[PDB]
RNA sequence: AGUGGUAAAGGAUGUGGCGCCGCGAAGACAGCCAGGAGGUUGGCUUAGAAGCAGCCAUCCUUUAAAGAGUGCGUAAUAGC
């Protein structure tokens, strides 16, 4: 029993069809159980969505090994991505909350208390000692725990362990536990990357794909300079051509990725950006491709 | 070894959460949950800045005894400062009786820098100002 | 403009309320530790401006206006000027001697001092930590005008 | 940093340095390299 | 400054000049020494404000004369 959990599903997207010959649920299932044999630090769990799974591994990188090996085998899949359920139920997120310090080494007391305190991580108690370290149990929920393991290992530098579980089904409170900064740049339809299209709004942050890179709707193609999200477009790149006439001028270029990693893009998500992976590629789209469709689920108060 | 640190808890409660406390129980002290012992002490002291305040011996221990309320706080402690319930002020429950300030200390004027034969006239004017009684 | 009418009109006022002031270089004490030897002054003395840490040129030269025989005892270095006039100078000298002596490397050394009207000698100001309650000059008169019968016993 | 112009210091105590007709502001923060000569 | 030997907007502890402001020799400012004082200890937030976390506080005693604390900051706090 280690930790971590990466929900699994089926690339029931539009792009067909597609990776190799194993993208449906059946083929996937056969793989899941096949792993529940050799793997010792793996913990496959069943969620609600027939196309979702709570892959509970050990380390943040651990889950990567299985994912990286999946592609080379020929099977595209998104990440993580099994969310939780807000119950129960009248109601407002009654999940649990369990924190655990990670000595310390007073060289992280202010580097770990920030994230926790910034994410509601209520320090139910910081059991200190005469040695030098000091525990820190922050009743955190499954909503503010995800990805935490990663950044955490980057704060204490390995030397920092702490799990959790739950203390009582809450209601999620009233604030969002991220939600990530710098909104993600989404597409407005399938086609291809157009130099004249990606040139315009290029200083509004960073880009992912290139050209003629022809992605689709919902698929992210860079991050926004702010937190807000948008759905630009271009191919088009337009427009050709002549005459007349000539000769000057101008010849905009463009920078490339910025690409990778996985491993460097997965943790990039937050709400619902299934990192659709393939046995030779790795994409990342939102739980709701169509823009207007996203607004359907949000829909906020009250 | 030996060397303790300064600290200021509350005057009434005893529950030792974050005050008694990553402070004492770390830099230098012993045991925790100083709350249970705090209530059996601060109970008779806590409502005008009471410093003691927070240390740690070779036990550690413990509650009992105390200091009192800081100057101003102890000078206008007989007010209510019930305000502050929003922003810096500022309506309802403000005054505390012109004589009260004096009657409240009065006694509440023993432990202080050098000495003071009055903490309700000159002492109040100061502390009181910090609260709202200017 | 600007030093003359302000402060200068109080330096000789609180130091002339009598005739028995002193001078001590106080400063080498932390705000907390310093507020103890001064704040407590009321105990060993009585608000006696035991040199509220004046400065220089202002306190020394001030002697001119008042003409306190020019407390020419020590104007250099720190200048506190223990106002023993505004309080009750006499035997309290000890209350300030041991305090700023038995604590830390030389708490606060002394400087000048006027004995009612005379100039207190530097080396003859400390040993007198206890202002002679007049008994001194009386411990060699009555017991020295009736002791030829004691060697008379 | 430079600019054939601007410069109204910045880093709250950003220095107006006279060097070679070189209007050069010097500070304690690279952010202020003010070269306008 | 080589302006002489073309240029504006506009920028500036340029150069020199006013006609003016600080001089408490109650001997100045940059340079110096030490203390950087006790009520200053919530108001919310107190996981922390107990000036150096956000919505204002504008008082007192007290002396180096007094910071309703201009500032390096985290967990308050602790240090400059």
Three-state SS string across B80-93, please?
CCCCCCCCCCCCCC
Return the half-sphere exposure (C-beta side, CA atoms, 13 A cut-off) of residue A26: 2
Which residues of chain C does B111 touch, with a Cβ-Cβ cutoff of 8 Å? none
- 3-state class percentages of chain C: helix first, strand second, coil last, to nearest 5: 15, 10, 75
What is the full DSSP assignment across C112-136?
EEEETTEEPPSTTSSTT-S---S-G
Give CB contacts under 8 A, 24+ apart, made by A124-131: A124/A99, A125/B17, A126/A101, A126/B18, A126/B22, A127/A101, A127/B32, A128/B22, A128/B25, A128/B26, A128/B32, A129/B25, A129/B26, A130/B26, A130/B30
Report the phi/psi class of residue C87: left, alpha or beta, with left for phi > 0 and alpha for psi in -120 to 50.
Answer: left
Q: Which of B16, B18, B22 to mutate to test the interface with A (most CBs of A within 10 A)?
A: B22
- Write down which residues 66-105 in C have CB closer than 7 A to strand E: 80
Residue A277: strand, helix, or coil:
strand
Q: Do residues B12 and B45 make contact, with C-beta atoms less than 8 angstroms apart?
A: yes
- Write down which residues 52-111 in B have CB closer than 7 A to strand E: 69-75, 81, 83-90
Q: Do residues A22 and A28 make contact, with C-beta atoms less than 8 angstroms apart?
A: yes
Written as six digits, the tokens of B95 are 């005054």
Nucleotides of E under 7 A from a protein CB: 1, 9-14, 22-28, 34-44, 46-48, 50, 55-66, 68, 74-78
Contact between B115 and C38 using a beta-carbon 8 Å cutoff: no
Written as six digits, the tokens of A16 are 């067909």
Distance CA B81, CA C54 (A): 40
Distance CA A281, CA A76 (A): 8
In this complex, the answer to whether residue B120 has its CB under 7 A from any atom of chain E, a nucleic strand, is no
Which residues of chain C does B114 touch, with a Cβ-Cβ cutoff of 8 Å? 35-36, 38-43
Which residues of chain C does B113 touch, with a Cβ-Cβ cutoff of 8 Å? 35-36, 39
In this complex, the answer to whether residue B117 has its CB under 7 A from any atom of chain E, a nucleic strand, is no
Method: cryo-EM
Contact between C41 and B114 using a beta-carbon 8 Å cutoff: yes
Written as six digits, the tokens of B90 are 């500022």
- Write down which residues 1-37 in D have CB closer than 7 A to strand E: 5-9, 16, 18, 21, 23, 36
What is the distance, to the nearest Å, from the Cα of residue A67 to the centroid of all Cα atoms in its chain? 14
For residue A278, give the H/E element and its range.
strand A277-278
Cβ burial B64-97 (10 Å sphere, 16+ → b, else e): eebebbbbbbbbbbbbebebeeeeeeeeeeeebe
Residue A264: strand, helix, or coil:
coil
Contact between C36 and B115 using a beta-carbon 8 Å cutoff: no
Residues 6 or more apart whose Cβ sits within 8 Å of residue C3: C58
For residue D25, give the H/E element and its range.
strand D22-26
- Resolution of the deposited coordinates, in angstroms? 5.0
Token look-up 């005054």 returns B95
Distance CA B133, CA A32 (A): 71
Q: Using N-to-C axis directions, what is the helix angle for A109-118 and A148-155, rounded to 10°?
A: 160
Name the nucleotide with the smallest C1'–CA separation from B73: E39
Distance CA C21, CA C33 (A): 23
Q: Which of A103, A116, A130, A136 to mutate to test the interface with B (most CBs of B within 10 A)?
A: A130
Q: Which residue is nearest to nucleotide E50 (CA to C1')?
A: B8
> How far: A131 CA to E76 C1' (Å)?
21
Q: Which residue is nearest to nucleotide E14 (CA to C1')?
A: D21
Cα→Cα distances C5→A177, C2, C59, C66, Å:
66, 7, 14, 15
Q: Which of A125, A136, A139 to mutate to test the interface with B (most CBs of B within 10 A)?
A: A125
C33 touches chain B (CB under 8 A): no
Token look-up 């003629």 returns A212
In this complex, the answer to whether residue A129 has its CB under 7 A from any atom of chain E, a nucleic strand, is no
Which residues of chain B does C43 touch, with a Cβ-Cβ cutoff of 8 Å? 114-115
Comparing C-alpha atoms, which of C138, C135, C89, C137 is closest to residue C112?
C89
Comparing C-alpha atoms, which of A165, A11, A168 is closest to residue A75?
A11
Contact between A129 and B26 using a beta-carbon 8 Å cutoff: yes
B114 touches chain C (CB under 8 A): yes
Distance CA A140, CA A127 (A): 17
Task: Measure in Å the smallest separation between the Cα of B112 and chain C Cα atoms.
Answer: 9
Distance CA B105, CA B124 (A): 9
Cβ burial D15-24 (10 Å sphere, 16+ → b, else e): eeeeeeeebb
């Amino acid at each position: 029993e280690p930790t971590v959990s990466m929900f699994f599903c089926v690339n029931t997207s539009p792009f067909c069809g597609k990776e190799g010959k194993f993208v449906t649920s059946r083929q996937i299932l056969d793989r899941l159980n096949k792993e529940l044999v050799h793997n010792v630090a793996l913990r496959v769990e069943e969620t609600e969505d027939a196309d979702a799974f709570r892959v509970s591994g050990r380390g943040e990188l651990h889950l990567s090994v299985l994912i990286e090996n999946m592609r080379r085998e020929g099977f595209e899949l998104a990440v993580s991505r099994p969310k939780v359920i807000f119950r129960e139920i009248d109601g407002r997120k009654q999940e649990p909350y369990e924190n655990v310090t990670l000595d310390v080494e007073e060289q992280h007391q202010g580097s770990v208390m920030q994230a926790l305190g910034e994410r509601k991580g209520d320090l139910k108690n910081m059991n200190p000692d005469g040695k030098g370290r000091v525990r820190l149990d922050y009743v955190i929920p499954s909503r503010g725990l995800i990805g935490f393991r990663s950044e955490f290992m980057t704060m204490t530098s390995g030397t920092g362990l702490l799990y959790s579980t739950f203390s009582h089904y809450d209601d999620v409170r009233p604030g969002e536990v991220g939600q990530r900064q710098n909104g993600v740049l989404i597409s407005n339809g399938q086609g291809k990357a157009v130099a004249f299209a990606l040139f315009g709004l290029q200083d509004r942050g960073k880009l992912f794909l290139g050209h003629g890179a022809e992605v689709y709707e919902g698929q992210i193609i860079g991050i926004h300079s702010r937190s807000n999200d948008l759905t630009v477009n271009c191919l088009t790149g337009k427009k050709l051509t002549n005459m007349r006439a000539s000769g000057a001028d101008e010849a905009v270029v463009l920078v490339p990725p910025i690409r990778m990693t996985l491993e460097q893009a997965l943790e990039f998500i937050d709400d619902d950006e299934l990192v659709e992976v393939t046995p030779t590629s790795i994409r990342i789209r939102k739980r709701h491709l169509t823009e207007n469709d996203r607004r359907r689920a949000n829909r906020a108060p009250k | 070894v030996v060397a303790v640190v300064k600290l200021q808890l509350p005057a009434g409660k005893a529950t030792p959460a974050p005050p008694v406390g990553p402070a004492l129980g770390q830099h230098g002290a012993n045991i925790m949950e100083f709350v249970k012992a705090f209530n059996a002490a601060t109970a008779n002291m806590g409502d005008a800045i009471v410093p003691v305040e927070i240390t740690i011996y070779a036990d550690r221990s413990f509650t009992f005894v105390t200091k009192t309320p800081p100057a101003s706080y102890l000078i206008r402690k007989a007010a209510g400062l019930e305000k502050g319930a929003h922003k810096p002020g500022r309506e309802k429950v403000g005054r505390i009786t012109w004589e009260q300030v004096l009657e409240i200390a009065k006694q509440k004027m023993p432990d202080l820098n050098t000495t003071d034969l009055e903490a309700a006239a000159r002492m109040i004017a100061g502390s009181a100002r910090s609260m709202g009684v200017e | 403009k600007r030093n003359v009418e302000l402060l200068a009109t109080l330096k000789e006022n609180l130091e002339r309320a009598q005739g028995s002031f002193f001078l001590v270089n106080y400063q080498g004490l932390p705000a907390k530790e310093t507020h103890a030897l001064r704040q407590a002054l009321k105990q060993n003395g009585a608000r006696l401006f035991v040199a509220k840490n004046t400065l220089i040129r202002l306190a020394l030269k001030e002697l001119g206006l008042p003409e306190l025989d020019g407390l020419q005892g020590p104007s250099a270095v720190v200048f506190y000027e223990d106002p023993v006039a505004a309080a009750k100078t006499l035997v309290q000298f000890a209350k300030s001697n041991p305090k700023g002596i038995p604590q830390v490397k030389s708490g606060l050394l002394q400087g000048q001092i006027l004995t009612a009207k005379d100039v207190e000698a530097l080396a003859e100001l400390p040993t007198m930590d206890e202002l002679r309650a007049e008994l001194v000059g009386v411990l060699q008169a009555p017991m020295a005008e009736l002791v030829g019968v004691l060697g008379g016993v | 940093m430079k600019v054939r112009a601007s410069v109204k210091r910045i880093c709250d105590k950003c220095k107006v340095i006279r060097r070679h007709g070189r209007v050069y502001v010097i500070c304690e923060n690279p952010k202020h390299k003010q070269r306008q000569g």
